[PDB]
Each structure stands twice: as C-alpha cells, then as structure tokens.
Amino acid sequence: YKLTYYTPEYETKDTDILAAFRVTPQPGVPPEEAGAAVAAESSTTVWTDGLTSLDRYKGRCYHIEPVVGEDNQYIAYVAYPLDLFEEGSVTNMFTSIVGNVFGFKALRALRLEDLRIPPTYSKTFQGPPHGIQVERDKLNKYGRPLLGCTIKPKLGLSAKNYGRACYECLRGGLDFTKDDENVNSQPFMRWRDRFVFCAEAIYKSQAETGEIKGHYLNATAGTCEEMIKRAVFARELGVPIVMHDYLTGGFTANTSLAHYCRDNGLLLHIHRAMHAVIDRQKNHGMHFRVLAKALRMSGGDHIHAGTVVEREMTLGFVDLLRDDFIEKDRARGIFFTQDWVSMPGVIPVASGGIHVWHMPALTEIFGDDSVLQFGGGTLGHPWGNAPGAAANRVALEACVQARNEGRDLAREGNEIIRSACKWSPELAAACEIW
C-alpha cells in the first residue's frame, strides 16, 4: 500500500536511521508509489504478522520530490527504526538498507546518496582506532597536511628494493610511504619479507631526520587469520601504522582489524579500492559519502578521499569524515544533519596525479587535517626519491607559511611556489618538469 509505506506526514524520530535515495521509477510508476516501494522493499501477508506489530518495524518514505538530476528522477527520504539494526555492525546496516531494494523491477535505477546515523546507533561502534587528534599527538606533527608517497612500480620489485625506495622517500621529508592496494603477499614479494625491509627503512629514515616516520603496511588478506597475522608482526616490529582495503576485504574483517589496532596502538590507513564500481554513476549505486560514513563507523584513521585536480561534493564528505557536527547542505551532498557525538574523525587522503604545483590548491581546499599522497609526483623527480620528497615537503611548507601570514593560496599559489624555488634547488628542478 502506498500509504502503509508512504507517510508524508511522518515526523522522524531522533533514533531513526534515515536514508536519502535517488530513485528512477520505471515508466508508469508514480513517485509516491516508487517511494513507498523503496521503503517497503528495504524493510517489511502471512499469519505470523499477527504475532507482532509490523508498524514498529517498517521503513517509511516520509518525503519524495522530483530531482533536478535528470529524466524522471526523485530523491526519496526513508526512515528506519533503531531496532532493525545490530549494534556495531556496518555489515548489518548495509544488508538491512541496501541488501534487496536495488533489484526491484518497478525501479529503473536506484542510488543511495546519504544516511543519517543517529547517536543511539553510532555510539555502538568503536569508530577510528585513534582519529585525527590522537594521530597528530602520537606522531608529534602539527600545523600542516601530512605527506606520503606510494611506492612504484606497483608489482615486480623485490622486498628489499621496495624498502630501499621507502627509505629514500622518507629521508627526504615525507611522513609516510605506502604499499599499493594490490600489494598484499605475492610470488615476487611475500608480505613478511616486505614488513622486515620496510621496518628497516622506517627506522633508518627516522634516525637520520629526527622526525617520526611510517609506512602503511598492507594487511589486506584472503582470510581474517592472515590479516591479523600481518597486523601482529607489524605490532612486533613496533611500527606506527598498517593498511587495509576495507571494501575488497569487507566490513566484517575491517571492523575486526580496527579493533586490533585500537587494542595495540596501531594507526590504520584505509584504501578504498573498488569504490568506483559502486559510486561512479549518478543514477545507480551508492555515493562515496555513504561508504565514507561507513568506514568512520567501522574504523579507520586515514581514508582515501580522491583528488581535487566535483569540489563541493568532495568537501562535503570531507566534513562528514572529520567534523563532529555537519549541518544539512544538499549543495555539498549532505542530505542530513549529522552529529557524531564525539566519535573521532578520519584524516582524508588526497592522491592521484598531484605534483608540487598543486600544493597551493590542495592545502587551500583540504586544510591541515589531510594527507597529500603523491606517486610520480615524488618518484618522478629528476634527482630521485629523496630530492623529490624534499621538493614536496618544501613546496608544502611554503604554502603553509604563506597561508599563515594571511596570503591567498588560491590567487597567489604560483608566486608562492616560484618564490620557494629561489632557495630550494630541489623544488626548482621539480617545477621544471611539471
């Protein structure tokens, strides 16, 4: 029934989990009907229904409106009761909300845009093993975005040659180096060997520079036993941070890892491999912000957030990832006011074709609480990894200094970089190739 499930006068409860769906009904399906279907098919005739009160377990579409997106498209708001969800289980939340409704015939397409996670539910999750503040304090780093570099080539390098690249990058000024998402354990490089050599690299660069260093050691594995075995050895090595591909590994496994990291003081870097399979298309799937909120709940200290070179949408989920209270702002993809009631924030990681000239914009857009992850941006420096890292570290600090003085990074970006090239041969050499 449209009005069993379509309740336009329903007032959401502070304990409801709310969802904003972008719905594309099939021809001949009224919006009210589509909305009701979305709610009904993602929630609740058989005699057993008489042994309880279905009304207290049904999801309900309390609002639907034509959207400006495209052809016969609408945003439907659905409210789900708190009791439907298993405490601390992102897996069950996803299963309950997006487990079945996307295949409904009456819908040509469907995409989950946002979720309002009430305090009564979020409080049942540990959340980030540490969070932005704790991480800065643990690593003793303040006043600037963090810097990192992904080791290349992806596969093919020996564990030792891999560590060599790590050391050179780190000693040059980067805070972190990182295992590619595909690097777990393979014939050309078994994981334990990589952990050993990367540990030597981490400590060599730290002793040389005097600054705390780290390398996101990928613990992503085929099984939970293997995943933990890798985290355990990193723990033995005393390194500060490990890594996991939460989507390919899965939420059940990620949550377990997040708990291990909390119990052992390990920072957890989260890569979002395979997200585009789900969040690329505007008409169907789940927008990344939903996957981002899910990660903050399941647990992660860093999370890849994409590149900056749409901006407003990125800034939108960045706030959803770092802030305690985010006000409704559909212009930035925020369909619901979100209150995290003190759950720690996650540091967003920007990566993808970024180089020294992008430093002003990146610093400007993300602010200090971010990680700027380079690739060839550092490994492609004509003088090698150490000079490349130095060029990026110098470029970044030049931007920070200028911003702190009140200069406009968005307008004076190029001059700030050009000016820094005067006293930094490394930066100058980088600005000549890019």
């Binding site: 600054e211 723990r235 500060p240 003081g265 600090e397 702190n404 003085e405």
Partner: protein, 120 residues
C-alpha cells in the same frame, strides 16, 4: 643533480624545511596563532629529536615531549611579547633548541609546533 644531505639537516617538523626564519617572518607566524585565538607557548630541550629508549611498541616514542618554558601565554595580544620570552630562553639556555607551540581551548588540543631557535 644534487644529493640530499645525510647529516647536519635534522628536522623539527612544520617549517623546518624552510630557510631560517627572520624576526619578521617569525612574528608573522606568532600573529597567525594570536589571530586564530590560539595560545602560544615555548618549549625547549638539549635533545632535539625523537628516539626510543623505554619502549618500542606501536605509537610509543621518547623525545616527543620537551620542557615548557614558563607557561602558555593566555590572553596574549602582542606577538612581540612571545619574541621577548624567546630571547630570554635563548639567553638562559643558548645550547638548547627552542620551539613555539600553540593550543586551542576549542579543539582542546595542541595544534601548532615550529622551531624558533637552534644552538650554534
């Protein structure tokens, strides 16, 4: 092609990769803190880097904490006041490193740290 030095260029996090700051540039960074409503504070040490002596477990390092020079300058509105303390510290401990940090009662946390003086 130039080779990045292996010694003599130990670092102190944010801003330590820029050339030595002048008194004017230093004042600007202090003003940044004041305008941001953050509380400046000086810290000093004869050991300028992190190490691991008492433990090697994840996240544990020695040498992160330095010694506080007097107290956080609450209600400071004149950046030159910080410079004055910096000069006193340098006089009392010329063979010590001195850094300027900042605190936010809003974020309830340390959010700034940059070297201000290094011994000869």
């Amino acid at each position: 092609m130039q080779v990045w030095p292996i010694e003599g260029i130990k670092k102190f996090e944010t801003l330590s990769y820029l050339p030595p700051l002048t008194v004017e540039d230093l004042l600007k960074q202090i003003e940044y803190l004041l305008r941001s409503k953050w509380v400046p504070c000086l810290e000093f040490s004869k050991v300028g880097f992190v190490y691991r002596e008492n433990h090697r477990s994840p996240g544990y390092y020695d040498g992160r904490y330095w010694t506080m020079w007097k107290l956080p300058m609450f209600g400071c509105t004149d950046a030159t006041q910080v410079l004055k303390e910096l000069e006193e510290a340098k006089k009392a401990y010329p063979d010590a490193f001195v850094r300027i940090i900042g605190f936010d009662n809003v974020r309830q946390v340390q959010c700034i740290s940059f070297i201000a003086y290094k011994p000869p």
